[PDB]
Amino acid sequence: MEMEKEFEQIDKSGSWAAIYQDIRHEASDFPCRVAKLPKNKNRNRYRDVSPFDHSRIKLHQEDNDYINASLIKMEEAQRSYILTQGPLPNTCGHFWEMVWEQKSRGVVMLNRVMEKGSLKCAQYWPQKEEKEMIFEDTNLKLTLISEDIKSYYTVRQLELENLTTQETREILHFHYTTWPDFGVPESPASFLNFLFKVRESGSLSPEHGPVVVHCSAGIGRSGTFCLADTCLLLMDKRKDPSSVDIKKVLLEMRKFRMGLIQTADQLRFSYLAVIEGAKFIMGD
């Protein structure tokens, strides 16, 4: 596998940091004027992580249309993703409104609500079956139906109800619960099993709206998920899989949301996930 030879050379030369900084230097920049409006200040978790105007998701209800979320539409791979920040206490209703309006089936979460005693994300879904959540601002109800706690991740079934129409929909919550407090997982095996489970559910298929992916900023861990899924699609689709250049794919994704992949170790981890996944899907 050509990508494996490249990985070995980068590892042997200790070049991960230099390659990562090259990506940062080459990354696109586009305006984010809506995100910077004063009325949206309290809708952004981090002042330096904003959606581009050209790719931002717009809310559809009769009120401010702004959410810190971006549509990443990968043309060659024929995949779309919504990457969003971890919801804030005051944006949980907006988050579920987005899920509803975009017709998503799956939400992918790659962090814990609290990590090393610091808040990373609001508790935007119910922890107990008998304590459903009502979002009065966007007129939505959310109930935990079932939970499957596995060794390295959890899959939940939720019921999201539009209280204005009484229509209900099933949402699958894919929660990777064991990403280390510092650095990346040592092996990508559980991350790949997680990705495969998301794929099998139909949450990434064209028959639904885009999967909604978040971490805390919605760019680092989130980026690894989208980058790995897209590169695996390209390797399986292209006539010559040795042409897949993860760096080029990442630069393409960064045209739709800034900052995807936030460290050199996340970059290395993405390559490692794509290599191991391709060995299983395509042959070793």
Catalytic positions are 215
Any binding-site annotation on 259? no
Any binding-site annotation on 183? no
Any binding-site annotation on 61? no
Q: How far is CA 25 from CA 52, 249, 255, in A?
A: 18, 15, 13
SS3 82: strand
What does the angle CA 159 – CA 108 – CA 254 come to, to the nearest 5 degrees?
A: 135
Any binding-site annotation on 221? yes
**How far is it, in rounded angstroms, from Cα 174 to Cα 75?**
25
Cβ-count burial 84-109 (b if 16+ within 10 Å, e if not): bbbbbeebbbbbbbbbbbbebbbbbb
Q: How far is CA 114 from CA 48, 128, 193, 265, in A?
A: 21, 18, 24, 22
The full length of the chain comes to 284
**How far is it, in rounded angstroms, from Cα 203 to Cα 175?**
14
**How far is it, in rounded angstroms, from Cα 211 to Cα 31?**
24
Any binding-site annotation on 181? yes
Any binding-site annotation on 220? yes
Nearest to 87 by CA among 34, 133, 130, 19: 133
Any binding-site annotation on 218? yes
Binding-site residues for substrate, in ranges, read 181, 215-221, 262
Binding-site residues, in ranges, read 181, 215-221, 262
